Amino acid sequence: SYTNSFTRGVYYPDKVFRSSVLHSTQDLFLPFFSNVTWFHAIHVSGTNGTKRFDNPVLPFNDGVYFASTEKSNIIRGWIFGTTLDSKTQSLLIVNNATNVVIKVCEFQFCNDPFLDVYQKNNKSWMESEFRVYSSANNCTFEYVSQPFLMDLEGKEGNFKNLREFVFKNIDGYFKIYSKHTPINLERDLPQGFSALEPLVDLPIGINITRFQTLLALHRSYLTPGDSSSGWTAGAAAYYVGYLQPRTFLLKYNENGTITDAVDCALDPLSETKCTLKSFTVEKGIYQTSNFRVQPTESIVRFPNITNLCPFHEVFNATTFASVYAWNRKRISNCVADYSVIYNFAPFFAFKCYGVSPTKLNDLCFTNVYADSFVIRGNEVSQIAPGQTGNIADYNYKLPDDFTGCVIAWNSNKLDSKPSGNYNYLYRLFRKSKLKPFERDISTEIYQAGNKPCNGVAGSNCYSPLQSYGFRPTYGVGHQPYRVVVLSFELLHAPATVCGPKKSTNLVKNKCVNFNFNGLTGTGVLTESNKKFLPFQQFGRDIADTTDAVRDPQTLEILDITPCSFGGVSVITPGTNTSNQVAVLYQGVNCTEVSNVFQTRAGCLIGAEYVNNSYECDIPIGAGICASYQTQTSQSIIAYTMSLG
């Protein structure tokens, strides 16, 4: 069966609070007035007496609009997965009593996940038996969620319980939405606007192309005599929707809640209200060409990578100097790519004290100072902001504002040698305390007490060097660890190392939003053999429209055709009178996609040509005029204007 969702399927895209604004976002919503897969979950009893029920493998393309009208315990679970053969992580959201067991585990439970109700009112009892799942493998993530993910039910004569759940397939979070709203009538369709707030956001990532609902079996006693034909009235009926990428215009209220929404697409009235930004649309043409829907994909990034900064020889070289002569290497006039660092070796302490490692490529930096030095094995953390160590106070010291990282790894394979290991030193004896980023390459004899030590050193005097014996038999704690600190300075200047801009694989023959080397727009990308000059990057036609651009990647020529379909217009007689509208595709012979009438300017879809002549209410074009009259139950008509 199928139904029609009038104005249902709207939720809060982001968590930012908004008030008295009309924002339009591009996300995956449910289009208004769609065909939701209506499935009445009731008992089916055949002539022979075998109990059966419908449970198809419904596909989870990009999201669903699963609603439910269960009374007590009919629908208390869901199942997600793309393989269902112990190959991908599943999702069993067990909506048990007073709690919800969200289990993300990869295993093959079964093919028909049946489960009874077992309405045991005991406080210490388990209703989810072991009949749903049968395997037990390693689970990646799980949760408790003490607040049960289930709305409250009401008990009244005609006031029933209504609830819906909006799910998506975002790799970041599952984006679970929930909202409860009581109905007022028992025989009327649930026509109304109800937004859904984000309940929980599971940070799990797994491919999910199909899903399965978890209904209630409840076949303890069929009670023959009353349910011989299965069921008569109906226990519950779950809806199954499908989200589609649309540009929905949301209108926030004063308190910060969505009271209505505009589709801005697939609907003439919504497209009119979107292109005019006014609810009460006047009598005009209001061209909205090349702006109707156009949702295909999302490919936006900066191509043409260039010479990588000399990050090598600082993470992998022949021999690094000690803290005595710690080498410095500034990096400028390049774009940093913090992706080859991890490929070197499994690190030991990736603690960036100034920024997040996943945010290094989101802001520009003036000049990164790469300082590498070999230290002992029990001092990997002594070199940190605000630490008083014997190798961190009389040697290379970090300040209280080190906005870099302390990237370090183990070098018990390259720097290790079965010998005396007189290659490194640490200079424990120092006169004063080294300031941040202070390098002392002096070899003067230290003198604590009153003892003249110009020539040589004795007992009171010491030498500013000591052999760093790294025996291969020594375990962790006395092994050579190579540490490199990338000092990220913050100076407002012509910075060079911003980020590793890497575009996608140049998708073509598809109407997607293109943003290549600054220029941003939309349209289709087709093949073209234009021979552009080697220094020309942008192209323009005679009408100042971007027709072709040079690929910043390897040598290839593209052709950005808008697909403007002539000029899409739409006529609206005013929302105060009615809501019926019509579209006029100017420049179309009614072949490039309801009453259809071809005019001299375009194809008018949504009105009929009347042979009569009245006063021109809405100017269509080329003598054509439309109006909203009570034809004998009112609709937009088309006619020729009367000159007298």
């Epitope: 000049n367 300040p399 906005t403 980023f437 202070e438 300075e489 200047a493």
Partner: antibody, heavy 122, light 110 residues
Framework: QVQLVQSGAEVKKPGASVKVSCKTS????????MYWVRQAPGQGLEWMGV????????TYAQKFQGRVTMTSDTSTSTVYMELSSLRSEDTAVYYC???????????????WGQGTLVTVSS | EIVLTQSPATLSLSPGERATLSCRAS??????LAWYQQKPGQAPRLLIY???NRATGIPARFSGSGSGTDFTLTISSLEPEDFAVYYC???????????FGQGTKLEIKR
């Protein structure tokens, strides 16, 4: 001994540019940052601003924000400061100050110059 | 930016006693503050940096302290070469916007 020598006196006109240099000495001008501070007659220190000895890594103030260009030079180890469009309120004594920390960090000013009385009149 | 304001702005004392000049702020600058000393006719010298430790070439009479949003300098014994104008400056980490105050003059009581 580290002694930062600066210029002497300098008179100008409304809507012009003054070039004031502050040569370094004693220390290796590759590791210590340098700042430029203004001292108005009767008032106190007003603006910050750092010039990198190695590269053109600078950071101008918020009051000026575009009307000052602080260049660098490793040949003679001397900094420069060219304030553009001098008004009747920019007459002050400009100083050059170093830092106790090295290239990455900056805590405060330790070594100061001698000042330069730049004025704007006829 | 952080409006460094000094309340007294005129601390008339006598040579030999102790002085306490305050320079408060708004944001947490517990470890981000500097102390200067500008005598009339020369360049300002660094008095106390990092707001907790002593600078180089500074006599032992200059001792600073403070944390949070309230700082003060504790001079041991005033000397004739100590009467000058003192300032305060914090070190903002990400936005380099080093700001100063107004200055407190140290007079001689007679």
């Amino acid at each position: 001994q580290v002694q930062l020598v600066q210029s002497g006196a300098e008179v100008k006109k409304p809507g012009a540019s003054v070039k004031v240099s502050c040569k370094t000495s004693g220390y290796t001008f590759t590791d210590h940052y340098m700042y430029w501070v203004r001292q108005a007659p009767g008032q106190g220190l007003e603006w910050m601003g750092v010039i990198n000895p190695d590269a053109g890594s600078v950071t101008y103030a918020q009051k000026f924000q575009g009307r000052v260009t602080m260049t660098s030079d490793t040949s003679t180890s001397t900094v420069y400061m060219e304030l553009s469009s001098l008004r009747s309120e920019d007459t002050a004594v400009y100083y050059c100050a170093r830092d106790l920390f090295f290239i990455p960090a900056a805590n405060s000013f330790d070594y100061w110059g001698q000042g330069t009385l730049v004025t704007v009149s006829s | 930016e952080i409006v460094l304001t000094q309340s007294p702005a005129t601390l008339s004392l006598s040579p030999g006693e102790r002085a306490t000049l305050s320079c408060r702020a708004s944001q947490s600058v517990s470890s981000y503050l500097a102390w200067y000393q500008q005598k009339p006719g020369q360049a300002p010298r660094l008095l106390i940096y990092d707001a907790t430790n002593r600078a180089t070439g500074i006599p032992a009479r200059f001792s600073g302290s403070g944390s949070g949003t309230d700082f003060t300098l504790t001079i041991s014994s005033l000397e004739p070469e100590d009467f000058a104008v003192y300032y305060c400056q914090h070190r903002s980490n990400w936005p380099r916007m080093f700001t100063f105050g107004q200055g407190t003059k140290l007079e001689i009581k007679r």
